[PDB]
Amino acid sequence: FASRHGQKGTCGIQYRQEDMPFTCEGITPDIIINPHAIPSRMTIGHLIECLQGKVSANKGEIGDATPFNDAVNVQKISNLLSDYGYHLRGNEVLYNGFTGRKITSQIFIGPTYYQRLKHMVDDKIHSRARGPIQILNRQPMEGRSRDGGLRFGEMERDCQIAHGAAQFLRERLFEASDPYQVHVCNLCGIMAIANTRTHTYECRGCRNKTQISLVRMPYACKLLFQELMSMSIAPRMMSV
Amino acid sequence: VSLMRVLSEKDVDPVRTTSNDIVEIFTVLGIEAVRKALERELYHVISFDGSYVNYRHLALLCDTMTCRGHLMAITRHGVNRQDTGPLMKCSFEETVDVLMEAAAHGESDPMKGVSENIMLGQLAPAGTGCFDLLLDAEKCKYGMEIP
Amino acid sequence: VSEVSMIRDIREREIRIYTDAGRICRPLLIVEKQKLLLKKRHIDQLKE
Amino acid sequence: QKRITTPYMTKYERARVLGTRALQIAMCAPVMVELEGETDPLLIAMKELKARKIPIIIRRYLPDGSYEDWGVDELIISD
Amino acid sequence: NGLTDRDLCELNECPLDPGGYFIINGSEKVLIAQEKMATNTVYVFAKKD
Amino acid sequence: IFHINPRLPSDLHPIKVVEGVKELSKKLVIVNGDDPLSRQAQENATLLFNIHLRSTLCSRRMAEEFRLSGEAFDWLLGEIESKFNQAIAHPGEMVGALAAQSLGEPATQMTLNKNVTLGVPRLKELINISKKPKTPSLTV
Amino acid sequence: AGILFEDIFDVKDIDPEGKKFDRVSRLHCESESFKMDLILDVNIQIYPVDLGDKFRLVIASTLYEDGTLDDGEYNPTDDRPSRADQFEYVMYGKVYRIEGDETSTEAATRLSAYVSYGGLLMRLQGDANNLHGFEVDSRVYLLMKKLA
Amino acid sequence: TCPNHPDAILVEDYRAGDMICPECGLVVGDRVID
Amino acid sequence: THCEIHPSMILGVCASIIPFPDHNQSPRNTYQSAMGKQAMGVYITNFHVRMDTLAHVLYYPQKPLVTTRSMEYLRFRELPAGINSIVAIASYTGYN
Amino acid sequence: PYANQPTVRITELTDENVKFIIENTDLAVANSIRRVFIAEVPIIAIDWVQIDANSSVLHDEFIAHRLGLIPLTSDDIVDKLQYSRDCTCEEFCPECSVEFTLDVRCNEDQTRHVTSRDLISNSPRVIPVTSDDILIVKLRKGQELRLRAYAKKGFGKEHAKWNPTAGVAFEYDPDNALRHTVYPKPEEWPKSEYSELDEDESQAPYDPNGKPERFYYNVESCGSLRPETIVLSALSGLKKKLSDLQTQLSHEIQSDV
Amino acid sequence: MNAPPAFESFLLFEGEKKITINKDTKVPNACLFTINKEDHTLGNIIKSQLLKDPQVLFAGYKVPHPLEHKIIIRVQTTPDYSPQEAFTNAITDLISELSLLEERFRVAIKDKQEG
Amino acid sequence: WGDQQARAGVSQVLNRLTFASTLSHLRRLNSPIGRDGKLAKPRQ
Amino acid sequence: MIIPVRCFTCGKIVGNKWEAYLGLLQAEYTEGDALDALGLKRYCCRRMLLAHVDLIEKLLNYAP
Amino acid sequence: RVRGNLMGKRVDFSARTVITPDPNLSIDQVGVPRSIAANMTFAEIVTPFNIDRLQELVRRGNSQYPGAKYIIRDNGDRIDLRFHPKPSDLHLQTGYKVERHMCDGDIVIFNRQPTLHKMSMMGHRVRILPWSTFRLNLSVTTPYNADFDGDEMNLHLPQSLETRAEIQELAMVPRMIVTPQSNRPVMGIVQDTLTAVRKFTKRDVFLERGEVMNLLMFLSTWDGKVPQPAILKPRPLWTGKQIFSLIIPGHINCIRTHSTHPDDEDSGPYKHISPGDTKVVVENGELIMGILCKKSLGTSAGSLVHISYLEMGHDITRLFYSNIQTVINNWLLIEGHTIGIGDSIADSKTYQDIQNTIKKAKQDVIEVIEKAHNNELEPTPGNTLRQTFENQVNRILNDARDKTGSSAQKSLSEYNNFKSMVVSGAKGSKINISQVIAVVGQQNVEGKRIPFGFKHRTLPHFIKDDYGPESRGFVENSYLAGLTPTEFFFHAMGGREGLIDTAVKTAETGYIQRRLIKSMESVMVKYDATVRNSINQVVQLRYGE
RNA sequence: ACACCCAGCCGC
Ligand SMILES: [Mg+2]
Ligand SMILES: [Zn+2]
Ligand SMILES: [Zn+2]
Ligand SMILES: [Zn+2]
Ligand SMILES: [Zn+2]
């Protein structure tokens, strides 16, 4: 929800009317925003709009907020607000909604135009647990629309080296993304032929059928080395 | 900057005339001197915001740029030129060119860094990965055997 | 036509009269010896 | 005697030793300490670390190839 | 062009619709005004390198 | 902790303070071993902390302003040992990535571009060796 | 009797540096019998004081007049009477500093006790012969009652 | 192709990413593609 | 020789709906200009007979109780984009 | 029993205001009574809408939402009905429900306003309160709105359509003697309605040995209940909640030792 | 998608208990009352009524989370009068308060309506 | 904007989200300066 | 799109008070006096009636 | 492939959601929506003393949260539970794996982009709350550089007990409070809790018995004894310092100074008895005097929370953060905090002083332009005449702005909330006050003043070659007074300059980050304590020498 | 039921 002066904010809690504060006339705030929104953002226009809103709602007209107008000084708005039984400058004594006690700081309250932005949280919430994967590399797909997985990116990797968590970094980049196993000849470090049904393992080339190493390795790195061997570069996976 | 001729001039202090040009400090005053100058310039650049960065990260950065005698740029032309290993140097930038160089010269990557072990999915030699956990049987025979 | 630019360069003696698509213009009132030509008659006629 | 390492169990050592012990206890390894009402293996792992009765020895690689075998019992814990 | 508000409402088109946008395949396509250096006029620039 | 009132005379013999700070100085170690290079490296590695420890825990200051007792001084020695041994950098720690992020995180906060250049362009001009600086200068 | 200090005082100033707080006033008082200087923060909202007012201070270890230490917990269900029943304005706080004119050779001549009532301060400055009850990090009670 | 269940069609779960049996819930093939 | 008709015409469309923009900070005027295009409301009156791919329609759009005189012409009095909320700038529980 | 004796007075009593003053009681009691005004007073409002046909310019959820906020007269009937989750009925029964039928259709050139008068209730004890009429939807020629609605009994905690009040105003200690709010500049603050001080003074002097025992109310009815009945049912509901807590703790103490 | 049912703020499903008593072992003769599915409305009045009792040394309440619906009322009395008895006395005192106030309000309605 | 190296993004789908969005999208301009370029002067 | 049945802030019924308010604008009254003739004392309901747009009248122009 | 699918890969078991605050959670806790909890799973291994729970979790199924999802037997086959309503396969024995739903107490990694440093990825414990947002503690937002204006933020769940242990013992929030970046606590009290504790620890604040027992309900680490009041006889009242002394953990000892501490007070006679409580001198467990602010309770080095972490470990510091944010917030329910028009208004004397100072500055600028026009104002050495005149004008306007800012902030009352939020250090500064109340001031584009965009003038409302304080850009008005249109446009340029800075600087600093890390990412501390890189070369003999 | 290309927008 955004005011008309660049005061962004998501809704954090929803309290009922018995939990809202209230004036001496039973006015509860529809929206409560922190004072910390406006000591560093200079949006005094928010306060002046709120003051003119109180004056306009009490008087019975739509107030004027034309830029560069010299008849709408804040002292004039304050003097008009004084005529309707309220404080000179905005404030009004609120009572605590829970304990019923007076608040010993007079809260600045009044009407202010708010806008609901397109960004609702039900359109952004997203989660995955071993969903669909891509064709090219067997990594999780991209984006909420496809039940896809978040990128654990290059900077995430780097801060995980900074922490020193080797196993967590491996679990994010091996176990939870694309686990895979390959069979590699021991003499030449080249991906061999494996027959998981008949258990007949052979390195075409060397005519080796005796020793073959199993390697746990990501599918993306397998595709990397297969594209290297497509371009006549041989990454030899020598495990000795 | 004409630092050496300025130092040679009469009636200027020859022990404290320091400039902010890194390469002239290197060519005139040495490698430890340019390490100290690079320290002082990197500390001077973090001064106007008032934020203090600890003197064990500036020193490490300066020792990495002044380790190999020649002053080391933090670009491909200085990080890919030191003889670390092809798989980190292709993970930084200029990927296919470093792989061609390694293929053509027959480079043998010893897998001793963290980035190589990351990209092949095995346990990286990180903070908790520089270990070797072993099981002892002398201590294991003790205790209560509930399950 | 009313959209035509008319600029005189005093110090360099240039009277550029650009009449082409793409120039960006604003309507401004005309001051003629420190008096607006927008008298009360124009406002009274525009109010009807 | 050929033991030029720190005699203090590092935080990474604590993390991975508790992790290995917790996974082992989850796979039905005998517990070296009495049980008085924990279910999750991590709490059992912390209790075994505090009791210094873990059956784990760690091998530290010096940066020249030589190793050093330490017992977690003979190390110094961080609390 | 030149239609009253009642005729616009009878045509199932909003009378407050500003217009100035094409319809292609049913998608409402608008052209944003590009901008270039003015033609037929001489400039003098100082390239600092 | 020991409820030391700084008005009454203490029961702390200053030679016990001197041997205590010497014993603590010997016992806390960064470079271990018994070699003429090892002793030199250990003395140099803790030189500033040893000067500060000898200055703060000197006999005159502790008999004039701190007025600690024997039990309080023994607890002080033990706690200094414990905190120093806790503060030693752990093996395996990636100080490189930690240093790089702890340098570059004070780079997203200062501004961009009678003084020399300063900010992100200065950082870019420093970590690159930059054979043609924009405003190189001396200080004579 | 467990009384550290006992004397009457007279107010000379109210806000010498300005009224820094709305509900607390920093009285500057001097004695007339033992020559005791004093600067004390008083809750002016519940106990108004004026210039020229006279009032008596008892600084005591306990309110219980029996030597039984109360250990500093709030127990209102105590039927056995206290010193606070005879006074109109009492307080409580830790002493945190005993400054003085001590030299390396010369012993103490004038002592000043700084006492903290959970934020409300006082300095009791005077002769060293009558501040022997004060010792650093100890709990004392302030006693007040106005006199005509 | 479910074991212990000859002639059983497999519900393809394009959300959960598996091929799943409507008698016992075994999975044939560890992941689905597309 | 010339005169501005009214200086509030230097502002655009979405910055014209800002009330008292001369009292704000310019980055916040820029932000409100950027998110005014994202505020939901009755986007067009014939939204019943148009079926776009996305559409957000607010139940109770309200004309701004503090209006700029320039947005009499933007038709913002007729297709508004928000509600006048009773707003108390306060610290209540720590959820704001 | 350490309980004091509150008293009441009534200033004026209209059909929409029951303005009363409570004396000699705690602040917490008065605040909880105000919260029970807002929340814990049951009335009857529509909660089960079934749209048979809706060709209006407003969609179905909007019509249902505007039907839920229509107040219904519940002067005596709410105390005898039950909650639909606390009854033996299958889905809805006339023991805890009231039926509503709306079969409006416009076949005239002029626009037709579907006011609350067109809701035909089943039991003639509940009705829309304006029987100045609450319109639901405007219709043109050839538009119909056919629906059946069921109205339950519910608290204001569950939804604000069951809130019987219309902005209860609760003020205590009007002349600011007991310093519970501190004015930075007291003389510029207006004196409230129940003020005893004159125009010259700003606030009453501080009272050290003082507690607030005076509470002014402006309980205003939306229309569902008479303003008598809101208070006379709020006190009963608070008493019922405290009695439920009492018997639950008695059952807890019985099965304790 | 994750909105709770609007009746969950005041309704107990099958299994959960309305009130529980937990003896607190930090200090002697103190109890925690975990009243479920209720809000500040009873917490404030119960706290005030227990504060009015002169033989109660501590009487407080908290709501641990506004999105949850528990209140925890901690009571500590003298070692002569059990805290459960204090809570019982407070509840029955508030019953007397509300009943007497209801009777006086009904008399006030009758007196204003008669003339 | 060509017969398929020409200008790109000249024509956009109209931003029917609110009336102000529609007006601000119809009255928009666009500079051809390469948007990824780390310049400073033309953006001011 | 249409006048709300209840005020958002307090809860006072303002659904029935739209048409008559328009009548008081057709009877050459100021908006403040028109609001005061309805009993809308609190400024929340004055915000409701004063700042409302009757977009349903615009929607009724189109054929059903 | 290498950068985009080897260094950084999409992962399973990850969630992303908009974040909202939660002051009722500990700093090591994160709120998780129910749908994310039911979707993401943890694979627990059936040990011989948890079958009684996992059987119930399986029997609940995938639609009865907290329930369970797929069962993995010893063979490796995955029985589904959402889709299998049969009773035969629900039985579990020893060695099985149950992919149960995420419950309370599950360790997660919780991350925000850009992941600038090690504090941007910390681990939390999961608390299930019934709405659709990730809820953090407030003080946790400072290391993440987060706020709740629409920030989305990521969730990762380990499913192996070694990974859960590594996060629990290396990447927890309390363990990772003090950064090695600056040897200062990167966490800290912020916003309302910071600006109310300044109110809470002032000398004038007293609490009656009811609100003391209300506040002590929220103190989790409380021994159970109500302390003795500071004032007893007229009415039992507690100062806020005693309540915060109960909040203070253990027996830490710190000395800090308040923001408004006078500099010469150390030379004054009342050196150790502050007349404004500006010296936080917290003794053995008790905050005996002092007013808390950013300098004493925030993220500064050597602050009180830094002392707490260095003395009492990390769990006690977690409880310290939670206790501050739980007690001070519930006191702020009573005290309340606002800001309004009346906090931006000074009296007529202050406005007259500002107007007189601005008129004097304008007259002096006109005088120095007239002096520079007639061949006077000889140039300073090392600068041209134009630069000398511009520096003279900038110096005059800077002194005028500083003087009128001092005049504006001198007239603030005690109750002015702008002051109450600046001196606490919660948000804002004195420059903000001077801009709101006094003139906004000189506004610069690329360092210099507003350039002559037109021919010899800045706007077509000014005469040609006008170097005054109105044409070249200098606001003579406040924010509350309103900007006349020329300086409104100049303010737009001034804001646009910072907007370009914030929009261009990211693309450079992200590349600097990437090159700096990839230069030294294998540089570690080996077990002989010699800092060495990948190919075993000594960089330092000891870390940090 | 995709895969590229383009555009817009969110947080810093
Ligand atoms: Mg944000
Ligand atoms: Zn082979
Ligand atoms: Zn099957
Ligand atoms: Zn029924
Ligand atoms: Zn209202």
PDB file of N, CA and C (backbone and C1' of nucleotides) and ligand atoms in Angstrom, chain A residues 8, chain N residues 112 146-151, chain O residues 11-12, ligand 1:
ATOM      1  N   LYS A   8       5.968   3.741   0.459  1.00  0.00           N
ATOM      2  CA  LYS A   8       5.705   2.319   0.272  1.00  0.00           C
ATOM      3  C   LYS A   8       5.532   1.623   1.620  1.00  0.00           C
TER       4      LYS A   8
ATOM      5  N   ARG N 112      19.055 -12.792   1.293  1.00  0.00           N
ATOM      6  CA  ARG N 112      18.538 -11.669   0.499  1.00  0.00           C
ATOM      7  C   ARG N 112      19.544 -11.186  -0.538  1.00  0.00           C
ATOM      8  N   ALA N 146      17.822  -5.074   4.572  1.00  0.00           N
ATOM      9  CA  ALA N 146      16.434  -5.264   4.179  1.00  0.00           C
ATOM     10  C   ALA N 146      15.538  -4.170   4.765  1.00  0.00           C
ATOM     11  N   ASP N 147      14.350  -4.016   4.180  1.00  0.00           N
ATOM     12  CA  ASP N 147      13.199  -3.372   4.812  1.00  0.00           C
ATOM     13  C   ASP N 147      11.935  -4.034   4.281  1.00  0.00           C
ATOM     14  N   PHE N 148      10.770  -3.529   4.660  1.00  0.00           N
ATOM     15  CA  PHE N 148       9.517  -4.196   4.330  1.00  0.00           C
ATOM     16  C   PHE N 148       8.662  -3.375   3.376  1.00  0.00           C
ATOM     17  N   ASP N 149       9.311  -2.689   2.445  1.00  0.00           N
ATOM     18  CA  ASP N 149       8.628  -1.912   1.428  1.00  0.00           C
ATOM     19  C   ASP N 149       8.284  -2.752   0.198  1.00  0.00           C
ATOM     20  N   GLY N 150       8.341  -4.076   0.320  1.00  0.00           N
ATOM     21  CA  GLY N 150       8.163  -5.027  -0.764  1.00  0.00           C
ATOM     22  C   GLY N 150       9.346  -5.950  -1.019  1.00  0.00           C
ATOM     23  N   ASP N 151      10.427  -5.897  -0.223  1.00  0.00           N
ATOM     24  CA  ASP N 151      11.536  -6.854  -0.327  1.00  0.00           C
ATOM     25  C   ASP N 151      11.018  -8.295  -0.299  1.00  0.00           C
TER      26      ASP N 151
ATOM     27  P     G O  11       9.949  -1.755  -5.030  1.00  0.00           P
ATOM     28  O5'   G O  11      11.192  -2.623  -4.483  1.00  0.00           O
ATOM     29  C5'   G O  11      10.966  -3.545  -3.390  1.00  0.00           C
ATOM     30  C4'   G O  11      12.290  -4.115  -2.953  1.00  0.00           C
ATOM     31  C3'   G O  11      13.456  -3.123  -2.903  1.00  0.00           C
ATOM     32  O3'   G O  11      13.475  -2.397  -1.680  1.00  0.00           O
ATOM     33  C1'   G O  11      14.126  -5.134  -3.989  1.00  0.00           C
ATOM     34  P     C O  12      14.245  -0.991  -1.565  1.00  0.00           P
ATOM     35  O5'   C O  12      15.804  -1.369  -1.734  1.00  0.00           O
ATOM     36  C5'   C O  12      16.475  -2.037  -0.638  1.00  0.00           C
ATOM     37  C4'   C O  12      17.843  -2.489  -1.085  1.00  0.00           C
ATOM     38  C3'   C O  12      18.810  -1.389  -1.536  1.00  0.00           C
ATOM     39  O3'   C O  12      19.431  -0.760  -0.422  1.00  0.00           O
ATOM     40  C1'   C O  12      18.913  -3.259  -3.016  1.00  0.00           C
TER      41        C O  12
HETATM   42 MG    MG P   1      12.960  -2.506   0.378  1.00  0.00          MG
END
